[PDB]
Amino acid sequence: PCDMLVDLDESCPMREPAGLNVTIYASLVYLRVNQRPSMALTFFQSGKGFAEVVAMIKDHFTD
Amino acid sequence: ALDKSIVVNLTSRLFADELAALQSKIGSVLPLGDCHRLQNIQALGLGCVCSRETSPDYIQIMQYLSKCTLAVLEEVRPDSLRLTRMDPSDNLQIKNVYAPFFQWDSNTQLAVLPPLFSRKDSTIVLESNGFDIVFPMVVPQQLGHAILQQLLVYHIYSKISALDLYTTNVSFMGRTYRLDVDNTDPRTALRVLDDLSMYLCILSALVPRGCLRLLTALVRHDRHPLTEVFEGVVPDEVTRIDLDQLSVPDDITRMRVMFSYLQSLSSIFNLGPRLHVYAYSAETLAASCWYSPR
Amino acid sequence: ECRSTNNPWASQRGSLGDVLYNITFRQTALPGMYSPCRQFFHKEDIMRY
Structure with a gap:
């Protein structure tokens, strides 16, 4: 679904390398709404290597 | 099955000077941008992120390194550079000419790092075309980790100064070394911190x-x-x-x-892509290894 | 030959034209923009001729 997917490589460019590989990641976020525990599952799409995307996912879920 | 070869077109005849350095490092790992046979020379360098006039940031350079496809040279003709390619998951001959020399054996482990000891020794300049080429360094994981350990310790204790023997020295069994920090942009090294x-x-x-x-x-x-x-x-x-x-x-x-x-x-604490050597020859300096991007 | 120089704010070795315009091009990810005056005020590129 287009609603769940969160793209990650998106730029003006305002240059990044090409490659052979772009990897779909899943995520699942424990949170609380209405003082009741509930989850949230989103998807991620980037070929940046695992060391960047964990830093890129934290900026998405900052709030 | 599959083909993998990259022949690099080039717009000027190289001199005998720079041809001697490229002939000396004939087996060498260097990244490049696009996955095609024909390619400009401005993708072959790691110098698109590590320049002279811009202050390099070695974390961001290393952050850059896990994106790129990697490549090994085959020949250096006077016009064109000819390279072979590294893809998951393929066994390949790798031959270390890397100047801060370490010893490998059969069943060792490797990883690719930016040049962190001598930039002048590990980058040759091409005055013929005006674009310089930066080679990366391949290190076993133990010193592959222990350089990134000392580099993160450095950026903590350069900010507190707002001396060198404890901050810029990588320790190892038998040898001590000097990290190359004169002009580093700490800001990409500090979001890690x-x-x-x-x-x-x-x-x-x-x-x-x-x-x-x-x-x-x-x-x-x-x-x-x-x-x-x-x-x-x-x-x-x-x-x-x-x-x-x-x-x-x-x-x-x-x-x-x-x-x-x-x-x-x-x-x-991620390194770049990792290289699992299963057989290494000692007197020939070649090896055999399968590439795994993680 | 009736005068050396028309304006002393371009031709003099440290003048305001040389301060603004001698600088070689610095690449950045944001798109750099063009200066027509950089053709005349550049010691390095004119020595190519």
């Missing part, structure tokens, strides 16, 4: 009490070879936390979360 301040103060909240009381029984008299960090004196902080009573099912829930956040420190 900003996330370390996130994990490390969570790890200070869920410390097990039985493991702190174990050290108060240990380091006072029981002296071991690997506990010489504390020098025989307990810290002032460890005596302040163990005032509670020990209970087993409290620390069961703590040691699971202690276990699960040490899974997360893989993401902040």
